[PDB]
Design an enzyme around this catalytic site. Structure first.
Site, mmCIF file in Angstrom:
data_model
loop_
_atom_site.group_PDB
_atom_site.id
_atom_site.type_symbol
_atom_site.label_atom_id
_atom_site.label_comp_id
_atom_site.label_asym_id
_atom_site.label_seq_id
_atom_site.Cartn_x
_atom_site.Cartn_y
_atom_site.Cartn_z
ATOM 1 N N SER A 145 48.076 -14.246 117.592
ATOM 2 C CA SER A 145 48.535 -15.374 116.774
ATOM 3 C C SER A 145 49.770 -16.049 117.379
ATOM 4 O O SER A 145 49.695 -16.566 118.491
ATOM 5 C CB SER A 145 48.746 -14.951 115.319
ATOM 6 O OG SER A 145 48.731 -16.085 114.468
ATOM 7 N N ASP A 242 38.786 -20.006 113.544
ATOM 8 C CA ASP A 242 39.958 -19.179 113.281
ATOM 9 C C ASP A 242 40.563 -19.512 111.915
ATOM 10 O O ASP A 242 40.744 -20.682 111.574
ATOM 11 C CB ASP A 242 40.977 -19.401 114.401
ATOM 12 C CG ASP A 242 42.213 -18.569 114.244
ATOM 13 O OD1 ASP A 242 42.186 -17.388 114.626
ATOM 14 O OD2 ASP A 242 43.223 -19.095 113.741
ATOM 15 N N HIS A 287 40.575 -13.727 110.812
ATOM 16 C CA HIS A 287 41.966 -13.567 111.232
ATOM 17 C C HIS A 287 42.220 -12.227 111.925
ATOM 18 O O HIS A 287 43.384 -11.855 112.107
ATOM 19 C CB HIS A 287 42.920 -13.721 110.041
ATOM 20 C CG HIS A 287 42.733 -12.679 108.981
ATOM 21 N ND1 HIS A 287 42.087 -12.935 107.790
ATOM 22 C CD2 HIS A 287 43.094 -11.373 108.939
ATOM 23 C CE1 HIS A 287 42.062 -11.835 107.057
ATOM 24 N NE2 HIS A 287 42.666 -10.872 107.732
HETATM 25 C C1 LIG Z 1 49.619 -18.846 112.978
HETATM 26 C C2 LIG Z 1 50.180 -19.885 113.945
HETATM 27 C C3 LIG Z 1 51.217 -19.551 114.799
HETATM 28 C C4 LIG Z 1 51.734 -20.485 115.684
HETATM 29 C C5 LIG Z 1 51.211 -21.772 115.720
HETATM 30 C C6 LIG Z 1 51.794 -22.782 116.708
HETATM 31 C C7 LIG Z 1 50.185 -22.124 114.850
HETATM 32 O O1 LIG Z 1 49.592 -23.409 114.870
HETATM 33 C C8 LIG Z 1 50.227 -24.540 114.348
HETATM 34 O O2 LIG Z 1 51.332 -24.494 113.905
HETATM 35 C C9 LIG Z 1 49.443 -25.849 114.377
HETATM 36 C C10 LIG Z 1 48.101 -25.817 114.718
HETATM 37 C C11 LIG Z 1 47.398 -27.014 114.732
HETATM 38 N N1 LIG Z 1 47.985 -28.162 114.452
HETATM 39 C C12 LIG Z 1 49.266 -28.203 114.128
HETATM 40 C C13 LIG Z 1 50.044 -27.058 114.076
HETATM 41 C C14 LIG Z 1 49.660 -21.178 113.972
#
Ligand SMILES: Cc1ccc(C)c(OC(=O)c2ccncc2)c1
Ligand SMILES: *[C@@H]1O[C@H](CO)[C@@H](O)[C@H](O)[C@H]1NC(C)=O
EC number: 3.1.1.98
Length: 341
Positions: A145, A242, A287
């Site tokens: 993640s 995901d 997840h």
């Molecule tokens: C669980 C997790 C950890 C880190 C990140 C960067 C995640 O992804 C987003 O923040 C993001 C995804 C797609 N569009 C905008 C934002 C998700």
């Protein structure tokens, strides 16, 4: 069991100024080292970090960490649980910086919290060199993640650090699990990353930074944009559907519009992996991560992830009967019968 070591440089800290650290189990008959980055979202301003500090404090502080942890999945030392790397030296690095492993900012008179993820990785590597890492043949930087995105942001910096310190024989590689996201349209209605980078003094890989230029560093948090700029070998594990991607997209798993949205998302994810030669991408809604004990069960085209990772090792010494590019083509969650139940 892996044993806790708090960093000897106590200025490299978790969010609240307590020392960061790592859990270690040595295997003196092995020159392979696995360094795993824990995940767990992030926080991006004073108010949402304060909320995280009240009910997610282990992700912001070492004060309550236990003395030991049990290695599971890819971190297990039992061959039945971990057919891939059971005899390796094992390291688990707790996520206590809330910055997707990107930060380089200390606590100060103007900063209520420290965001030091990128510096924690560097200091763990430095202190391990005195504990046997100096003799390694392979350092695999892995993570799930936020830790999987952390691998993408930090693998080439670890390689550069070891080169500059005088260890050119250690081969640095990355394994990014569940950290390959799309900056897509939501089903119902990126700024959080942009705000976070400013709040954290976040850093991205230099070749990617030079493409997108000042102010646009948020692009380098997206695997399909940062991956082509990386020089270290990187294996990408990503569910086509995901659950964290769907949460950001405001989907909670069906009528026609949502069916089309879900099918289009799987197709787009598959497209981004077409030119990623080492990858494992099952058509599942999940997840679940690579440190779970039953990680051996899922297969793509009849090949498990531990097998695909072994084939990747062989490829870095196509191979007959030993594939490394494994992407499902069926278009709906659980169209692969081996998906986690
Ligand atoms: C669980 C997790 C950890 C880190 C990140 C960067 C995640 O992804 C987003 O923040 C993001 C995804 C797609 N569009 C905008 C934002 C998700
Ligand atoms: C501790 O870490 C900080 C940040 O990386 C660094 O500036 C400092 O020199 C380190 N201290 C020692 C003694 O190495």
């Amino acid at each position: 069991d892996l044993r806790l070591h708090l960093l000897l440089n106590t200025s490299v800290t978790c969010n609240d100024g307590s020392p960061a650290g790592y859990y270690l189990k040595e295997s003196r008959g092995s020159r392979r080292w696995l360094l795993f980055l824990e995940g767990g979202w992030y926080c991006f301003n004073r108010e949402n970090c304060d909320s995280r500090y009240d009910t997610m404090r282990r992700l912001m502080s070492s004060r309550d960490w236990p003395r030991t942890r049990t290695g599971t999945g890819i971190l297990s030392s039992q061959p039945e649980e971990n057919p891939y790397w059971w005899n390796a030296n094992m390291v688990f690095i707790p996520y206590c910086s809330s910055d997707v492993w990107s930060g380089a900012s200390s606590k100060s008179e103007k900063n209520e919290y420290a965001f030091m993820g990128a510096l924690i990785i560097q200091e763990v590597v430095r202190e391990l060199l005195g504990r046997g890492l100096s003799g390694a043949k392979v350092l695999l930087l892995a993570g799930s993640s936020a830790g999987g995105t952390g691998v993408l942001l930090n693998v080439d910096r670890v390689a550069e650090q070891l080169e500059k310190l005088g260890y050119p024989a250690i081969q640095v590689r990355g394994l990014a699990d569940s950290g390959w996201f799309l900056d897509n349209k939501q089903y119902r209605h990126t700024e959080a990353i942009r705000r976070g980078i400013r709040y954290w003094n976040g850093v991205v890989p230099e070749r990617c930074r030079r493409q997108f230029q000042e102010g646009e560093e948020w692009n380098c948090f997206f695997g399909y944009k940062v991956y082509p700029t990386l020089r270290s070998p990187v294996f990408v594990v990503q569910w086509l559907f995901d659950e964290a991607q769907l949460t950001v997209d405001n989907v909670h798993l069906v009528q026609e519009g949502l069916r089309l949205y879900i099918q289009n998302l799987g197709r787009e994810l598959r497209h981004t992996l077409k030119d990623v030669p080492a990858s494992f991408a099952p058509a599942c809604l999940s997840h679940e991560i690579i440190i779970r004990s039953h990680w051996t069960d899922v297969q793509v085209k009849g090949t498990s992830l531990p097998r695909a990772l072994h084939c990747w090792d062989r490829s870095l010494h196509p191979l007959k009967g030993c594939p490394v590019h494994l992407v499902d083509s069926c278009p709906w969650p659980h169209c692969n019968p081996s998906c986690p139940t």
